[PDB]
Amino acid sequence: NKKTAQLLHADTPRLVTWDAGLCTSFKIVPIVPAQVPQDVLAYTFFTSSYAIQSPFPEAAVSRIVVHTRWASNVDFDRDSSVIMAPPTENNIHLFKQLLNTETLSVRGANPLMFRANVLHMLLEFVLDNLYLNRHTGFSQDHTPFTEGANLRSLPGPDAEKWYSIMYPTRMGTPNVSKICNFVASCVRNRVGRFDRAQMMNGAMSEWVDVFETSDALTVSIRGRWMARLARMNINPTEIEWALTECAQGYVTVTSPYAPSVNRLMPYRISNAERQISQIIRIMNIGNNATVIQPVLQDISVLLQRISPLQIDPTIISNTMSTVSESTTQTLSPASSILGKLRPSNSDFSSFRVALAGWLYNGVVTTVIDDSSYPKDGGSVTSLENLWDFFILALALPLTTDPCAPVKAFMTLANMMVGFETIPMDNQIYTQSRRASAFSTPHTWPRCFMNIQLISPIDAPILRQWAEIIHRYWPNPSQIRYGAPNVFGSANLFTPPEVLLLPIDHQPANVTTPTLDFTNELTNWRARVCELMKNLVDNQRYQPGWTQSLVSSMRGTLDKLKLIKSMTPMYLQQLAPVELAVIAPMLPFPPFQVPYVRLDRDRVPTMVGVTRQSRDTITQPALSLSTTNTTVGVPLALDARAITVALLSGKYPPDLVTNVWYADAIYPMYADTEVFSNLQRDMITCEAVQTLVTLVAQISETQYPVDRYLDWIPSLRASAATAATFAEWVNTSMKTAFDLSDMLLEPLLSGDPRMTQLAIQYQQYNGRTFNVIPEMPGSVIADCVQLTAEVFNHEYNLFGIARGDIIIGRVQSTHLWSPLAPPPDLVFDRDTPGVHIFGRDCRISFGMNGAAPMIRDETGMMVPFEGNWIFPLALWQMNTRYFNQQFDAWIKTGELRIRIEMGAYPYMLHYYDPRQYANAWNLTSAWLEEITPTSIPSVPFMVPISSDHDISSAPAVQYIISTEYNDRSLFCTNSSSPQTIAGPDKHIPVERYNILTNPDAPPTQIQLPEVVDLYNVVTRYAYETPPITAVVMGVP
Amino acid sequence: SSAGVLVHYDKPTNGHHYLLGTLTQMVSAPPYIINATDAMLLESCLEQFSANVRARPAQPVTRLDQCYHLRWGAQYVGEDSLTYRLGVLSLLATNGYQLARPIPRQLTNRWLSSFVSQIMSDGVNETPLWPQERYVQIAYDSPSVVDGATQYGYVRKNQLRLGMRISALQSLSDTPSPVQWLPQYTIDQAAMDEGDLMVSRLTQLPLRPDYGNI
Amino acid sequence: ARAAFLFKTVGFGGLQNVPINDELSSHLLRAGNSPWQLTQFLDWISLGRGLATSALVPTAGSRYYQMSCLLSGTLQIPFRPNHRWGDIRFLRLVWSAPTLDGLVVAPPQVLAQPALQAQADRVYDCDDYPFLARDPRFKHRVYQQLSAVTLLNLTGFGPISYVRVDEDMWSGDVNQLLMNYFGHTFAEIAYTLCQASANRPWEHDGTYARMTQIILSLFWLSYVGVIHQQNTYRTFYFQCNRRGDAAEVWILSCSLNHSAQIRPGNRSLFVMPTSPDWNMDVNLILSSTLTGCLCSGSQLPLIDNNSVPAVSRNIHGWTGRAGNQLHGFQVRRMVTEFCDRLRRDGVMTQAQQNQIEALADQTQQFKRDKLEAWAREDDQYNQANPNSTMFRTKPFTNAQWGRGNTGATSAAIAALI
């Protein structure tokens, strides 16, 4: 139901927000409270004593993390962000969510969807962070802590927290804690605002530059956003001119001449984009016109709203009254021809249907009811025949059926058969087959375009017929339309900005109505009337035909010339102007076919279009040579009413061209269609390119194709899975940009792994003609790629572990991180007593109290211990057995297994260091529940830290990673002269060199460096006024 | 442009102007449909022929050249067209080439159609040139000075050397009689049955001759 | 105006081939197939108040430089005496169009084929290939960036503004159009112009010609600081008070205090710098962008052959036999002269210019060091790279860290009122 709607309007867009809080999406999670308070420690070491907020609370574990929507206000949220949990908790279900085809587990999944899942994570955090920043407050400081600055103030409530927190700068106290000498690194001269804008007295800034606890990514993203947006702004003058030249030089809007401060309005884009979007519209409409009927009606409406046309039967009536006589004859041809009139009730409309058909011509043909036809031969003894036939004669130059005068002549042919006939060498069809039955010029004989093939007395009639036609069949011309910088162009069958017409245009000579009677239509009906005259001058139509009937039919056709309908010049001159002016007001730009007058040699035949290819051919020339999109449809209509319309001209006597248009257009110039269309379809094509780029991270293609993260388990699969991913994205999107269209249809149709947009047509002699687009820019792609590469080094920063692990007897007394490397006990595939494994399996037997063993791929004989290298995937064969074989043999048996997963999420488990025990339970569990698709996030058993030293204690642990990833740890135990126990971490130099380093520029980029979280931003003090408040709309 | 964009450069008093044709073509001159574009072209061709007939150190035309070469339209039909052929011949006769059959003052309608019949055939051009809307060439030293006055659409290949001697005629007419000729041999050889098989598609045999008197 | 259109293909100071590697294209062709990457090129500025930086491309210096290297490689194929399109690799490169558009990986057969050889200094005409030679419009369109390449290519040094001052640039429609952008950042209207010609370059003597003339002219005046709050050009002048840094935002202003007069006499000149630090600046790139259109709509003067390297002389499209030799400088002494004659006017104090110079030349130092360091790194790369070759930017020399030769040029470009 939304299809014509998609040709009617768009959903409400969202382009501007105003961040009434914070932009960056990160807070620290301090989760594990410290061992405090210790006793000989005086309470003098903390701030909860004299109560001013610390920028960071103290905790035994504290790490920076992303969190969306915890510090910011908006009048509008932006569609379902992503946040995670500490490494002590599991969000993993994501991975058992939205794509898995089989699941049962709470801890474990198919390694397949993995890359896809983190992909989704990426793109959704791409999604959420697009808000727009309203420049933020200020207020002069009053305690000499600061430089008395204008602190960035929140005009909303409860801002003192951030002051305390964003500014350990603002912090200062005699004490030596981590934070103390940490912040000692900062200076005081580069705080808060960097700069601003100011002019136009009685105002705030026009833009500002200030320092904020802030990332770089969202900054970069939304700035890119802002910029691409800004690529489309306008200034009054051109909008004024749009009005004007489209106002027919009559109605006014005036441009400002006063000082311009700032008036933002990003709308206008390049032409190719709207071209191709509407092109896709044209794609996904194949083979139905029930959609077209509404707009046809609407056209007739809006044109009826603008025309001084009146329809009148009375002319017909008084005219046909043309006889005075004594009555004994056989017939009254008066009432006969009247049979077409039916001497009002109730003619209202439907003259303009095929006329519109001219204006969207490129797609449909116009015809009339075969029911209107007398399908019954003819005889001059029946002038009903000639009446109807002439009705048809009228209709024909108003008909777009590609056989119009063909069928005209064909009537005649069907009539005088055996009295008069034409040349022919084919009986595929003969002269005795009717209309709606003869289409191609290759159905039209040589004689059909060769008047020489008959003697002009053997059949003078048809000879003069073809001759007349060749000399007089109506002549076409053309005209321009609209303004390109406000409307663009959809004309592709023709040089840009042209608009043909089956008719020749004739300008008028004065602003009044014009009394015009030399029209090729005037002359045209005159032609066919005299043709009838000459016809009936036959010697043979008077062995019983009367002088009375003679003068009757003479004066018949004569007064048929004597008609004074006011439509001919009407449509010949200024109705074209009605067309030109509706064109913009008309939604859904057109496509019309180029025309012939007599040509039968350049008619187009077919249309062929691709959205994708199946072969190694990429050159669109040879590519579309088999891909295709052809639709073709008739529209049957009336000949009676339309002929009448030709035959019924009556207009108001006070009608005058100029003033009528002047008044009429004026109300009729509120139009907002195009802007909404631009927004929607811009977003549309961007979705195209973004989506296919996503795909590109899954598949291979003749397209330039590369991927970098593939080491994450995921592989190609069916088109089913493909479109699965695809529509998941689409739904995320329609959420994100908040509209409710139908979209991606061509992409949700066949093979999306490859695309091609070539659009062509075939002619009377092949000679096809085609077009393909080049895309505009697409920042979101750049963004998401950059992010993929960000996380290409910041995985663990999100609980994401690369590398692998090793299960082994870890029995010692020294305290050191399982995520640290062994002081002395590293193991891999290069040690003695290491073994890698094929499917070699032969278990020995310990009965006979003998030496039990297992057979190596070597072929040796092996007990259960050593340094071994195994594909856990094999463990998942009959893991029941597997576990049963080695549970104890690893428990206190001393085998060592370097083992592979590649990548995963993990799990944390803290505990008192001041005691000892074993970690065998989750050992057993996390082992046993392996399936080919069950894999709990890797557990980890680490004690908890302190401030000082102790005597040591026993320790028994099992497994270690392969690579370092403890970056995620941000810091621990702030209010401390140091963290002694465990390791110690510190607020990384990698985060605030803005002030710690005095030599950094105002801007700097940490790529792929561990990024900052305090950053300078330019907050936008722009204002984007509405499109009507500036423009003075005046008659 | 697809309705025919042709121009004669050499200045009329008409002045700067271009031209398009309409959607009509001549049925007459059996057996040809005739799109007036190429028709008026043929007329220009006749002009150039008439030109090439004589050669006098004062042939007081005002313009040797009046024909029209494609200003626009080269984007709908290739070089194998009859029309491209015509324009070739246009610039050729512009050089000064001329038919190798006696030429009527007015060359019959059917003369024209027969001409068409001929040229339309298979074969090649004698003239390598292929002109351009990018530019139209100036011959080696063809005796005409229209180049000597204009640039607009004109670039000579100074490299050009493909020329001929000079020759024309003072009388061209007809005779009925099958008249004499004498052979003047050459040097090389050939193969016999092969010449037989050659003539096997050329003979006038078989026919009854006028036996005449013995 | 101009119906003749040519270009040239880059040479090398010692490379046997193209230094372009597919990686570059890919990370650019991540989207689309365009030969010009105008959109994110321009948007890659990061608003220009700061730059965008990567290992692959730290500067739009690097960005456009490899853009050039790429397109130099690209043009190789279709453009020959034997013109053509399709099925011959240039590092697996294939177009998909007779208009020579689209860019994807070579077909399997074409993956195996040898790539088309290249040659240096390959000047050609932009009018030979027939297809586009039928569409004037896309031809013009491409030409405005063929020029952007060419001009920077023609010299062993950087870009050049062809500044021009002429009166008729005052007209009613003109100051009208002017009025549209008061209190406006140069960069944004530059964007607007990129738009308003990327759609369609305006016609030869377009209103917008005189406009952009005003734009670049007033720009460079403020740049040297020619005009100011009192010395005003029909009372208009940009600003950016944050001077002393690698980012400026010069913005329209009107001064109701004193106005300076334009004597009759049309003038113009051609400016380059001599410090390869411009990679932080953008304004040069936009000036290039627009001057390309100025050429593609208006036939413009040419420079002396001696003004350019001998091998690159006598070019119909660019190298005439006369025309004002270039104008070079360095931003360091540029802002020096700038602030100095400004205080000469007595609208300052000394310590003002002094504290300017301090931070300015500090930044100069740091970023030159970074430049040279990245140079060293790239060298070591080449040493490790026998086959995957490249230059991030146009290779340079320390010999380019001295005189601006700008001395008399000060008064010269100053006497253009």
Residue numbers in the entry:
A (entry chain B): 241 to 1275
B (entry chain O): 216 to 429
C (entry chain P): 2 to 418
Share the article's original sentences.
The particles harbour 10-separate genome segments and comprise two principle protein layers, the innermost composed of 120 copies of protein λ1 clamped together by 150 copies of σ2 (viral polymerases, λ3, are attached inside adjacent to the icosahedral fivefold axes).
In addition virion-like particles of two types, ‘empty’ and ‘full’, were observed. For the empty virion-like particles, reconstructions focused on the fivefold regions and pseudo sixfold regions yielded reconstructions at 6.5 and 5.6 Å respectively. Although there is essentially no RNA in these empty particles there is evidence that the λ3 polymerase is attached at the expected position to the interior of λ1 close to the fivefold axis. However there is no evidence for the lattice-work organisation of the N-terminal 181 residues of λ1 B subunits on the inside of the particle which has been assumed to play a role in organising their assembly around the threefold axes, indeed there is no evidence for ordered structure for the first 259 residues of the B subunit (in the A subunit there is density for residue 241 onwards).
